[PDB]
Symmetry: D3
Subunit: 251 residues, 6 copies
Amino acid sequence: DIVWNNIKAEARALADCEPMLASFYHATLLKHENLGSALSYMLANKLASPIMPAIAIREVVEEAYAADPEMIASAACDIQAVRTRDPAVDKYSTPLLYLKGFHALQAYRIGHWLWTQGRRALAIFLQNQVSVSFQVDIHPAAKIGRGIMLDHATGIVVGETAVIEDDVSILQSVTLGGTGKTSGDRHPKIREGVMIGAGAKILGNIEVGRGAKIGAGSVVLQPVPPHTTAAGVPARIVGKPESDKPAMDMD
Amino acid sequence: ELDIVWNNIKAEARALADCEPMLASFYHATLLKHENLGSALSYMLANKLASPIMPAIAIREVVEEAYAADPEMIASAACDIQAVRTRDPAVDKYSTPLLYLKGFHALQAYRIGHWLWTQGRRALAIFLQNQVSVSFQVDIHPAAKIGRGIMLDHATGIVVGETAVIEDDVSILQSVTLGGTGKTSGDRHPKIREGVMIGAGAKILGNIEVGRGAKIGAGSVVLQPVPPHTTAAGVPARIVGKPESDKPAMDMDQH
Amino acid sequence: LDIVWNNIKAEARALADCEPMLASFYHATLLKHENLGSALSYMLANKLASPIMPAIAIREVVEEAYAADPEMIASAACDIQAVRTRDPAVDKYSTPLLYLKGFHALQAYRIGHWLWTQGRRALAIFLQNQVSVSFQVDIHPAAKIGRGIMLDHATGIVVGETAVIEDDVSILQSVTLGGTGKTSGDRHPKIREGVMIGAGAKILGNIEVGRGAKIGAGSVVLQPVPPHTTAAGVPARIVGKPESDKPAMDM
Amino acid sequence: LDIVWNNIKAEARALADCEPMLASFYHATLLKHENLGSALSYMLANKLASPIMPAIAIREVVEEAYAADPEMIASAACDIQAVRTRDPAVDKYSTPLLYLKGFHALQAYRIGHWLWTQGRRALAIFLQNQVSVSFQVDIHPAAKIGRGIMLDHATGIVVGETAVIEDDVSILQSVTLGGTGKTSGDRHPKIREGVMIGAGAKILGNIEVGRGAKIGAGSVVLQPVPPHTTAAGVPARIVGKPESDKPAMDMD
Amino acid sequence: ELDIVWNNIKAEARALADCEPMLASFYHATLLKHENLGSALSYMLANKLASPIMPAIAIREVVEEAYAADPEMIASAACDIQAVRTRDPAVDKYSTPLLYLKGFHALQAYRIGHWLWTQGRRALAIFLQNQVSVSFQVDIHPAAKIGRGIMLDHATGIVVGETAVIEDDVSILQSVTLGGTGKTSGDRHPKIREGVMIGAGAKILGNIEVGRGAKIGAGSVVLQPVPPHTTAAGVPARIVGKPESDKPAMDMDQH
Amino acid sequence: ELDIVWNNIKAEARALADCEPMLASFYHATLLKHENLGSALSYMLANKLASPIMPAIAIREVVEEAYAADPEMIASAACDIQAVRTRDPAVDKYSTPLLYLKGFHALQAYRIGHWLWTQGRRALAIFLQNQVSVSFQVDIHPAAKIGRGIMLDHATGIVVGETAVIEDDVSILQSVTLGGTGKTSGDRHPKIREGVMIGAGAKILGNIEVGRGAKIGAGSVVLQPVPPHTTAAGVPARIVGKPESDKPAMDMD
C-alpha cells in the first residue's frame, strides 16, 4: 500500500520529467488502482511473444494473483529489497519498470504457481522465455521467497531443487546449480540473509547457513555454515561477515 | 536413431497439445505438422533466428538448403537431443531441447553458420553468429569445428572462438569460454576432446589440448594443456585428480 | 573519422556483391550515409528501438546528442579501430558497426551518458536497462568511459555508477566493474589507460588499476592494483608484470 | 445474450478440432471467456492494437466502457443475431465475432461513441480513424447507431457526425450516410428502424428515411424518403413499395 | 503460358535489383531466389497473408500444399499476370502484378481459399477470405468459381459472393460487386461469362447471366440478365448498345 | 501561410497532450518535438508507410530528400491542411488531418512518389503507390499531376490514374475514380480543373475536361467533357444545373 503510493508519486514526477515517456509511465503505473495490476501489465508486456501475446499472458498472471495473492505481497518486498540494497536505485518504481532481475523474479513466481497447479508445459515454456529474454534461468519447481534481489542478473541460473529463503541477495552470473544425471535433491538450499557475489557457482544439495556470505567468483562444493564468509575456488572459509544478515549490506 | 527419437517427440507433442490448450497450435506448428526432425528443426531455426533483415521464411530457405546439402547435421542434432535428455536430470522429454532450450538452439544455429562458412558464405555466417549471440547469449564463431552429442546446458554466456574444436560427446555449462589469446590470426583456441565435461564459468584460453575424457571444474581458468582422464581445476588450473568415470561428460559429476 | 569511414563504405560495396540477401541491409546501414555519425544514429536507432520508443524517435535523440557533443562520433571511430587490431577474428572496419554487441552497447552507453549529463536521468536509465536486456551489457550512464575501448564478446559485462574506464582499455565477456555497500558514493573501479581485463574478472569497490596493468581471466580483485602489474587468482595477488607497456593492445 | 454466447462456445469447441492451426486462436478469442463481454474486449483489443496503443491498453479502455454502459454488450449480441439470419453466407453465431470487419467496426464505433459521450474526443477520433484504415469503415463517434445492425462486407462505409441509425437496419459495402455543407450542425441522414440500404448508396444531408423503407443499390438519395417505400435511381425517385414490412430482415 | 513469363519476371528483377539499392534484397527475396513461379507465389502469399495468428512460415506450408495438390492454380496465375500486362497500360512488366497489385494478390489468395473449401477446410478458407478483405480490400467468398486470365485492376472495394462464377478472360474494376439477393442460401450471385469487362462501381445482384462477351457500364446496377455481346449501363441497367470488340475485356473500351 | 498553421498545430498539440495521457508521447513524438511542418510530415510519412521491406527510418531518409529537393511539397501540404479544416465541418483543428486522416496521408504520400517518379525512381514510386493503396485504400498513380489545397474526405476507394490532372482547390470524396480507358498508353484520364467538387462514388473515365468551377454529383459516371461552372450528374452524366457558388469545392453543396 505505501510502496504503491510512492510508485504512483514518482510516476507523476517522471511523467513531467520526460515527455517521450509520459504515456509509458501512464500505461505502466499511473493507470492502475494497485500494484497487482501494474505487475500483470508489466509481466504481460515483458513475457509477450507471438505464441502468447501480452493480452493472453495477462489473463494467466491475473489468474495466479487471484489464486495466490501473496505473490503480489512477495513482489512488494522484492521492490523494497532492491531500493535499500541497491545504491544505484533511488526509487520504488525503477525495479518495476526497468530491472530484469526483478522481472525475472516475478515471472518465476508465475511459473512456480503454474507448476504447483501441475501446469508444467506452460511453466517450462515461460522459464525458457525468461532465460532468453532476461538472461535468467530459474526452474519453476525452485522454492524462492520474499525480499530477494537479483542485481544486474545477466547469467543467473537456479535449478530444479533449489531453495532461496526470505531476505537473500544475488548478483550477475550466480549459479545455484546441480550435480549428477539423476533426479532428486541436488541444488543449494540458500538460507535467510545470505549474500552471493558476482560469478559464484554453488553446486549440489548443500546448505548455506542462515546469514552466510558467499564471495564473488567462489565455487562452493561443500556446505557452508551460518554466519560464515566462504570464498576461493574451491571454497574454504576465510571469514565471518560484518553484519548479522549480509544481504542487507552488500559488503 | 533419428526415426525413433522423432516418434517420441511427436508422441510427447500429442500429449502436450492436450495438456495446455493455449499452446496446442504452438505444439502443432513446431512439432506435430512435420513429417521428420529436419523439418521441425528448420521451423524452429527460422522462427528463432528471424529478424526484419532476414525473416523466418527466408532463414528457413537457407536452413533447408544446408540440410539438403549436408543431412548429417540433422543426425548431429538428434545426438544433441539424446545427450541432453540423459545428462540433464531437469529434462525428461525428447521435445524439451527442441522447443525450449537456447543451448540446443544455438548449437544448431552454429551448424548452419558452419555449413555457410564451409561454402565461403562468410558474410552470412558472421551475421548469424552475432544474431545468435544477441538472441541466445551464445557466441560461437562459424569456423569452429564442433561434433555430435553435445550439451550446452543453460548456455547463457558461452563463447567459442575461431580455431576451436569440440569433439563428440562433450558437455559444457553456462559462461564457459573456449576463447583465444593474441592479436594474430592462426591456431589459438582450445581443442576439447571426446568425453570432456566443462563446468560453469570455466575460461580455457589459447591453443591447448584437453585430452580425451578429461574434466574441467567449475570456475577454472585453464592456461596450460590438460591430459586425458584428468580433473583440472583452480584459478589458474592445476590437476587436482582423475575423474570418477571414463567419459565424465555422461555423468556431470561437478564434485 | 574520414579515413576509415571510406573503408567501411569500401567494404560495404564488396559485401553488397558477396551476399544478395543482405545488399539492402548493407545499403541501409552503411552505403546510404555521407559519414559515420549518420551510420551510427541509424544503427543505434535500429538496435535501441522498441514499442515505447521507435527507431525513428531514438534517432532524433541520438542526432541531438551527436550535434551537442560531436566527440562521441570520434570516440566511436577509435572504438572501431581498437576492435579491428585487437580482435584477430575481426578483419574489417565495418564488422563492429554492423554486428558486435559490445560495440553497440558501448555507443548506446555514450548516448545515455550524454543524457545523464543533461539531467535527463529517466531516459538514461530506460536505455541503460534496454541495453542490458538487448545486448547483455549492463552499464550505468553515470560511468566515465573513454575512447579506444573494446568489449569483445561482451555477454555479461557489468559496469556500475561510479566507475571510470580510460582510453585504450580492453575488456571481455562477464567482466564486472561492480560496487560494494548499500550506500551512494564512490564504490566502483577506476580502470586506467592501457589495462586488459580477461574473461570473467570481477573487480569490486573503489580501487585503482594502474596505468598499463593486466587483470587475468577469472580474477576477483578486491584491492588496488598497481601500474604495469599482472594480477590474477581469486582473490587477486600479483603473479608478475605484463609482456607489453599497454597490454590492452596485445591481448 | 446468454443463449447466443453458448452457441459461440459450442461452435468454438467444434472448430478447435476442425483446424489445428487455429485451435489456440479459437481458444484465445472464444473458449477461454466466461461471457460475451470478455470475448468482445479481447477481440477489440487485438483488432485495434497499434504501437501507439497496444492491445493490452485498449482492452482496459473497452472494459471500462462495458463496465460503464453494459448495454453495448447487449447491442452487440443483437448485431450478431442480425448477421446470422440476414447473411445467407454466415451460418454461425461466431463468424461475425471472429471474422467480419463490419461487425468489428460497428463495435469499435460503440467504444468511440462512449468515449465521445465522456468528452474523450481526442481518443474517439484516433480510434475512428484507425478503424477507417484497419477495417475500411469510417464512422464518426458522435453518430447515434442502435442495435441489430448489419454492415455486410462493409468496405467503404462512411457515416458522418450527425447521423442516426435506429434498431434493425442493414447496410452494405460503400454505403455513405454522409453530409453536405462546410458548416457544423444537422446534415446527416436519420435512417429509421427496418431500412435496408444496398451496395453503393449515397444518402446525403439531413433527411429522414422512414420506418421500414428500402434504398436500392447504387442510389443517391438527396431528398427525404417516406416509410415503407422503395427509393432507387441516381438521383433517387420512388420506384415502389418493398415486399416486407421491415426489408432489413429479408435483403430483397 | 508459364515458364516464358517466369524468365521475364527474373529478367526484369535483375534490372530492378540494380535500379534501386533499397529494394535489391526485396527483388531477390521475392523473385530472383526462386526456380519457378510457384515458389515466388507461395513466398508472396505467405508474406502478404501473414499475421500473428498465422505466420508467413505457416501460411507458406498451406499454399505449397495446395499448389502440390492442384498445380493448375499456378497456371491460372500466370494467365492472370499476362492479362494485367496487356490490359493495364499502367503496367509495363510481368513482375508488377506479382510484387505490387492487390487485385492480383487477392485473386491468388482466393484460389488458396477455394482449394481449401473444396477440401472441406471451411474454417481456414473463411479466415483467409476475411483477412484478405481487411488486408487488400477485396471480399471474395471461397466457394465462388473464378477462372484464369482475370484482372481486378485497382480492386479496392470488390465484393464477390458465395455462388458467383467468373469465367476465363474477364476484367473487373474497383468497387465492383458481384453480390446476392435474399436472406436464403442457394444460387443468388452473377454468372459472369468469358470476355466481359465490368467498369468501376458496378453492382450486379442476384443469379443473372452476363453473356459471353458483354460489357457492363461503370456505376451500373444490373438487376436483370444481360445478353452476349451487349453493352449494359445506367442505374438500373438497360441496354444502350453493343461493344466495339468481340471480347471487350481485352480492350478496356470504357465508353 | 506555413508558419501560422504550424504554430496552431503545436498549440493544439500541447492542449491534447494534457487532454489524453495515453497519447501524450504520441502528440509529442508526432508534433511537439519538431521545429517545423516538414519534419512532422517526414515523421508521419515514415511511420505510416513503414513496412518490413522499408522501415520508417529508411522511408524518412527518402521523404527528407524530397522535401530538401522540392520544398513546395511542404507548402502544398499546408494548403491541403487548410482545405480540410474549412471544408470539413467534422474537422475543427489544423492537426487532425496530419495525425489522423488517411485522405491527407495518401495525398502527401502521392507527392513523395510523384517526386520520385520525376527523378526516374519509378520502381520505388510504384512500390509506394501500391502500399498506399493497401494501407490507406487510395490508389494514385505517381505520374498524376495533382496540386495544392486538395481534400480527399473519407477517401476509402479513391482511384486516380497515370495521366490525370487535378488543379488547385479541388475536393473529392470516397470512391471517386479519376480513371482511364483503353489498353494503350497516352492521355486517357480526367483533367479536373480548379474549384471542382466531386461527390461520393463518382466515376470519371477517359481524357475529359471538367471545367474550372464545375460540380460532379454523387454517384455520377461522367463519360463526356463537362463545362466550367456546371453541375453534372446522372449515370451517365448530363447537365442538371449550375452550382450555387463560383468554386463549389469550398462549400460542399
